[PDB]
């Protein structure tokens, strides 16, 4: 997260981190006791899931191994369209005041809506600086017509843009799969942006979750 600040303590109980061993790979969100929702470009053979603490690497944080993951069938490693994936935990997560299921959307929030994106991604770019505390930044949803002016052919229908005019506030490497919450529901998952990160007027791009609830629900039902 670029130009942000530590998220409010305990305000993101559904935020998880996908680790490679004990090293940050991507962010993610807890859907239920057995599933984490994240970005498809974060695909790995297996993962270690961090839950229950705003401090990445917290010795007292819950840790669960995940061996199975399933990317949306329409995902492209080329364009990153449909950049979402479901990761199945090997054992069910222990829910508590600090580990909760995220609230999935029933509708899409309109352009201009103020939202919050979080993650343990780098706070600087290209030079990397990884925070120990979960970082947050508020951004506003940008209409597709307005975002297309910037990204043109890079933009696809199920991608959602968000940012603040003339501001560096944005997501960066390590934040993928992370939550973009607007007025109580998960509206996006961090997907991509420009490099270096934080270039003013270059919106952050997210997978628009309100377009995928059917797939998310059916996929979980499928793997029991
Ligand atoms: C995987 C996830 O952690 C990460 C999060 C992120 C979000 C915003 C900026 C940087 C990183 N997402 C990615 O890494 C995605 C998927 C891999 C490629 N990717 C990118 O965001 C890459 C770095 N962006 C680009 O390639 C963009 C389209 N190009 C440019 O920025 C170069 C052209 C220009 O600068 O205009």
């Amino acid at each position: 997260i670029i130009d942000g600040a530590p998220c409010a303590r305990g305000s993101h109980p559904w935020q998880v981190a996908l680790l490679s061993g004990n090293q940050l790979h991507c962010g993610g969100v807890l859907v239920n006791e057995r599933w984490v929702l994240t970005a498809a470009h974060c695909k790995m053979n297996e993962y270690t899931v961090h839950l229950g603490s705003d401090t990445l690497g917290d010795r007292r944080a819950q840790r669960i191994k995940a061996s199975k993951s399933f990317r949306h069938p329409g995902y492209s490693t080329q364009t990153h369209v449909n950049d979402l994936m479901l990761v199945k935990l090997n054992s069910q997560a222990r829910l508590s005041s600090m580990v909760k299921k995220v609230r999935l959307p029933s509708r899409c929030e309109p352009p201009g809506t103020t939202c919050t994106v979080s993650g343990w991604g780098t706070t600087t770019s290209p030079d990397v600086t990884f925070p120990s505390d979960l970082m947050c930044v508020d951004v506003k949803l940008i209409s597709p017509q307005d975002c297309t002016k910037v990204y043109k052919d890079l933009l696809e229908n199920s991608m959602l843009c968000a940012g603040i005019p003339d501001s560096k506030k944005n997501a960066c490497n390590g934040d993928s799969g992370g939550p973009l919450v607007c007025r109580g529901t998960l509206q996006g998952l961090v997907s991509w942006g420009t490099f270096p990160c934080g270039q003013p007027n270059d919106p952050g791009v997210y997978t628009q979750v309100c377009k995928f609830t059917k797939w998310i629900n059916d996929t979980m039902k499928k793997h029991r």
Side-chain angles (χ1 to χ4, degrees), residues 9 19 22 24 62 66 86 90 100 102 108 110 126 131-133 135 146 190 204 222:
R9 217 65 181 175
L19 318 174
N22 292 129
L24 176 69
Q62 183 173 177
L86 278 164
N90 289 353
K100 305 181 178 184
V102 68
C108 305
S132 54
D133 298 339
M135 301 296 178
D146 283 345
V190 179
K222 188 172 174 180

Side-chain angles (χ1 to χ4, degrees), residues 25-26 39 41-42 80 83 151 154 170-177 190-197 199 202:
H25 186 61
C26 285
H41 76 257
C42 294
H80 300 302
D83 194 17
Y151 293 130
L154 302 192
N170 222 153
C172 198
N173 299 273
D175 290 322
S176 286
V190 179
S191 183
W192 59 274
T194 50
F195 182 80
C197 302
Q199 307 188 208
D202 270 3

Side-chain angles (χ1 to χ4, degrees), residues 68-79:
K68 303 172 182 178
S69 57
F70 309 96
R71 294 172 293 179
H72 184 285
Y75 175 63
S76 165
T77 55
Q78 318 170 186
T79 62

Side-chain angles (χ1 to χ4, degrees), residues 70-113:
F70 309 96
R71 294 172 293 179
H72 184 285
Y75 175 63
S76 165
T77 55
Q78 318 170 186
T79 62
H80 300 302
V81 63
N82 302 314
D83 194 17
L84 73 161
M85 169 179 73
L86 278 164
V87 176
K88 172 112 166 180
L89 303 179
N90 289 353
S91 58
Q92 87 172 197
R94 275 213 301 154
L95 308 177
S96 69
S97 62
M98 289 196 282
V99 180
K100 305 181 178 184
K101 304 192 186 67
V102 68
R103 184 187 163 196
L104 291 173
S106 63
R107 291 175 293 215
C108 305
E109 285 295 327
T113 303

Side-chain angles (χ1 to χ4, degrees), residues 139-216:
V139 291
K140 296 190 181 68
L141 300 191
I142 296 166
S143 75
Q145 21 285 167
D146 283 345
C147 201
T148 302
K149 300 179 180 181
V150 183
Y151 293 130
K152 302 174 180 61
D153 200 40
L154 302 192
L155 273 178
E156 299 279 1
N157 306 58
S158 52
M159 290 179 190
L160 174 69
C161 304
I164 297 291
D166 302 307
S167 179
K168 297 181 64 62
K169 298 184 189 308
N170 222 153
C172 198
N173 299 273
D175 290 322
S176 286
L180 171 65
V181 303
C182 318
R183 301 162 105 291
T185 64
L186 180 67
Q187 286 290 311
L189 296 172
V190 179
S191 183
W192 59 274
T194 50
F195 182 80
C197 302
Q199 307 188 208
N201 301 133
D202 270 3
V205 185
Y206 306 70
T207 296
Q208 188 171 36
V209 185
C210 68
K211 294 290 193 302
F212 296 97
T213 46
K214 201 277 192 65
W215 175 77
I216 294 168

Side-chain angles (χ1 to χ4, degrees), residues 34-55:
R34 308 283 307 203
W35 298 93
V36 168
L37 180 60
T38 189
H41 76 257
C42 294
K43 176 70 173 183
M44 296 204 294
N45 179 54
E46 60 195 8
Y47 327 70
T48 287
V49 182
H50 160 97
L51 326 79
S53 180
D54 297 304
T55 298

